[PDB]
Amino acid sequence: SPFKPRNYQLELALPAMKGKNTIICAPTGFGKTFVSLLICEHHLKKFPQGQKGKVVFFANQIPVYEQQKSVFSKYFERHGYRVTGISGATAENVPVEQIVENNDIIILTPQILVNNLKKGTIPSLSIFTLMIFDECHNTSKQHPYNMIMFNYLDQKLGGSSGPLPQVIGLTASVGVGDAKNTDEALDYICKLCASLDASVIATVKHNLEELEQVVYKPQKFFRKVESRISDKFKYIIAQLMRDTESLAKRICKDLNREFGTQKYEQWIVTVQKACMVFQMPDKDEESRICKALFLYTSHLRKYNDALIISEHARMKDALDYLKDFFSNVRAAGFDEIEQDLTQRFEEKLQELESVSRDPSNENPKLEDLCFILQEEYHLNPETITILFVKTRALVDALKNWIEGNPKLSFLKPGILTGDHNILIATSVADEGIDIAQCNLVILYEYVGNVIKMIQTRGRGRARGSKCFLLTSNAGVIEKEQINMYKEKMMNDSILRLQTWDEAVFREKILHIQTHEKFIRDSQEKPKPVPDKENKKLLCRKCKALACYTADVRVIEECHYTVLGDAFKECFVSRPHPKPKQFSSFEKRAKIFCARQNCSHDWGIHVKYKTFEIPVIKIESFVVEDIATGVQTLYSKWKDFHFEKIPFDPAE
RNA sequence: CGACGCUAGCGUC
RNA sequence: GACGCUAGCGUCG
Ligand SMILES: [Mg+2]
Ligand SMILES: [Zn+2]
C-alpha cells in the first residue's frame, strides 16, 4: 500500500475488509478508487492456497470502465492477478465464460452480465467472491444493477445454496426518493440496503476533520428573477399559431389551451397521435390530407419550442433556430404546403428580425448571468466555470450569445453533450470521471434530484467554490429547497441506522427482501394470446403501404426485420454520420421513405452476421387490419402482439 | 434498432 | 405508495 492513504479511507474500508456487505457513503472526491483498491487487495490476500478469489467491478459508463480497468491492471499485475474487462464493443464472438474463469479481477458494464446471466453462459453469481457496484444508488427499479441483484436474491432465498459473493456499493448519497419525513426516509434507505443485501453503512465519523480538509462544501446561491416584461415575438408567434391551427380546423374540424407550455406540446403530440387514423373511402387524397396535417402539427410543435427558447434565452437565438428549421425542411422536397407555410413566414420575417435585434429586448435572466460572470472573473480572472442548461437547443444558444455578447470578451466557451474558461452542459449521469476543478457552477433553469445535487458538489471540491441557481419560476427554487431538506433527512436517518444492533438490522433486511421477492414473482405477468393474421403497416408521414406482418421475422426477440423486395421498393438508404455499433450488429445507414416529399425516419440499415438488412421502429408507423379497416398506433415494440416468427437464415 | 435511469407535466386502481 | 403515457435530458447493449 505505498501511496499514502488517509485515515478516513481506512475507516470507510474497514467493514468491507471485515466481510460485511457494505455501502460506502462519502462525498464525491473522497477518493473512492483507492478504497476499492485497498478492499480488493485485502479481499484476495485473504485466501488459503487451495482456494482463489474472483472480483467483479461494475461501472455503467464507458469512461469510468476504461479508467478503472487501466488502474486495476496497473496496481495488480505486480501482485500476480489477471485483470480484464468486457463492454459492448468487446462482447461479441468471445467465449465470455472462459474469459471470466481465466481472470481474477473483472470490470464490466452491467448490461453484459445480465445478458450473460439470462442466456446461462454464466450459470450463477457464486462464481464471484466480491461484487462492487460503483454509484450503487441506482440499484433501483429496472436498472441492470437491480436485475443482477434480483438474480442474487433468487439464489439467496431459494433452496439453492451456493456460496454467495460479498456485495459492496459505493455512492456519494443514497437518495430518499419521494420521502417526506425521517421515518419514510429510513424505510427507503432500508429498502435500498435490501436491494444490495447490505448489513453496514460506512460513513466518516471518527476522522471527520481530516475529510472536511479534503472535500469542501461549495456555497449555494439562489437568484429568483422574473420573466420578460415585454413579449413582441410572443404576440406575432401566437398569431402564427392560431393561423396554422385554423388550417387544422379546415381539414380536421375536431378539437384549456395555453400557447407555449408543455401542456401545448403534449396536446400537439396528441393531435398527431389521434390523426393517424383518418380513414376515408378515398386513399389518395386521404394520404395527402393526413400529411398536410402531420406537417401542420410538426410545424406547430417547432413553433412552440421557439417561444420556450425565447423565454429562456435571446430571441435572435430562437430566430436562428427556426431559420435552421426551415433550411432543414427546404431540402425535404417542395409541395404547395412548404411554399405556403414558409411564405407566410417570409412575410413576418423582417419585422421579426427588427423585433429580435434591438437592445430594448433582453431576457433579464441573460443579463443576470452576465452580471454573475462579470463579477466572478473580475475577482478571479482564472475562474473555470460550468453552466447547466436543460435542452440542448439552449446549450448552443447560450454559447453563441457568449461569443456574440461583447461584455464577456474574456469568456472562451466549450461544450459537452451526449484551455477553456467555461463549459456549457445539459446533465452528466453520475459523478463522472476526472474533470478540471471548476470553482463556479451555475444552474440555469435547472431542476434535479438529491443525488445529482450531492454529486454536483464534486466539481468544486476546493474551498471557496461557489454555485448559483437562477430562475424565473419560484417553483424551481422551492424544488431545490425540498431537496436540501431531503439531504438533511438522509443524513439523520443513516446515523439513526448505525445506532442499531447489527442483527436486528440484518433480520430487518432479510424480511424486507423476502417480501420484495414474492412481490416480483407475483408481478410476473403471463402472456396474452398472440393473434395470427395479415396486418398492414403504413407510413406515419405518407401512410403509403410498407408491408404486412407476415413479411417480418424477429432477431433475438428485440429487433424486427423484413424479407422480400416489397420493402426494398419503398425506402432509400442513407449512409450515416454516426456509424455506431451495438452488440452483434454494425450500423451503416438510416433508411427513409422513398416516396416523394415524405422522407420520414423509419428505421436503420445494418450488417448482421452475413446479411445486410434494414430494421425498423413501430413508433414510426401505423397498423391497420383487413376485416376491421381500423388502424392503431403502438410506441414500444414489446407492446405489440402478433405471431413472433423468429428470424430464419434459411429464407 | 432496442434497455434502462433522471426530470417536468398528466392519468389509473 | 407504486404502475402507465407524453416530452425533455443522460446512459448503456
Ligand atoms: Mg444510468
Ligand atoms: Zn411515408
Author numbering: 239 to 493, 501 to 663, 690 to 922
Give me lines lifted from the publication on this model:
By contrast, the RIG-I SMS variant C268F shows the opposite effect and is constitutively active, although this mutation is only two amino acids away from K270A in the same ATP phosphate-binding ‘P-loop’ in motif I. In order to elucidate the molecular basis of autoimmune signaling by RIG-I C268F, we went on to crystalize RIG-I Δ2CARD C268F in the presence of a 14mer dsRNA and ADP·BeFx or ATP and determined the corresponding structures. Crystal 1 had space group P212121 and diffracted to 3.3 Å, crystal 2 had space group P6522 and diffracted until 2.9 Å. We did not detect any density for a bound nucleotide in either structure. Intriguingly, despite an overall high structural similarity to wtRIG-I Δ2CARD bound to dsRNA, the SMS mutant shows crucial amino acid side chain rearrangements in the active site that stabilize the protein in an activated state but prevent binding and co-crystalization of a nucleotide. In particular, the bulky F268 side chain displaces the evolutionary invariant motif I K270 from its central ATP phosphate-binding position in the P-loop, into a position where the Nε of K270 is situated at a site normally occupied by the Mg2+ ion. As a result, K270 now forms a salt bridge with E702 from the C-terminal RecA-like domain 2A, which in turn occupies the ATP γ-phosphate binding site. The resulting overall conformation resembles the ATP-bound state of RIG-I, but without ATP, and could thus explain how C268F is able to signal independently of any nucleotide. Unlike wild type RIG-I, which requires both RNA and ATP bound in order to be activated for downstream signaling, RIG-I C268F can signal independently of ATP in the presence of RNA. Slight intramolecular rearrangements within the RIG-I C268F ATP-binding pocket appear to compensate for ATP binding and render the protein active in the presence of dsRNA only.
Retinoic acid-inducible gene I (RIG-I)-like receptors (RLRs) are cytosolic innate immune sensors that recognize viral double-stranded (ds)RNAs. RLRs (RIG-I, MDA5 and LGP2) are members of the so-called Superfamily II (SF2) helicases/translocases. They share a multi-domain architecture that consists of a central SF2 ATPase domain accompanied by two N-terminal tandem caspase activation and recruitment domains (2CARD, only in RIG-I and MDA5) and a C-terminal regulatory domain (CTD or RD). Simultaneous binding of an RNA ligand and ATP to RIG-I switches the protein into an active state in which the otherwise shielded 2CARD is released. Activated RIG-I homo-tetramerizes via 2CARD and nucleates the polymerisation of its adapter protein, mitochondrial antiviral-signaling (MAVS), to elicit the innate immune signaling cascade.
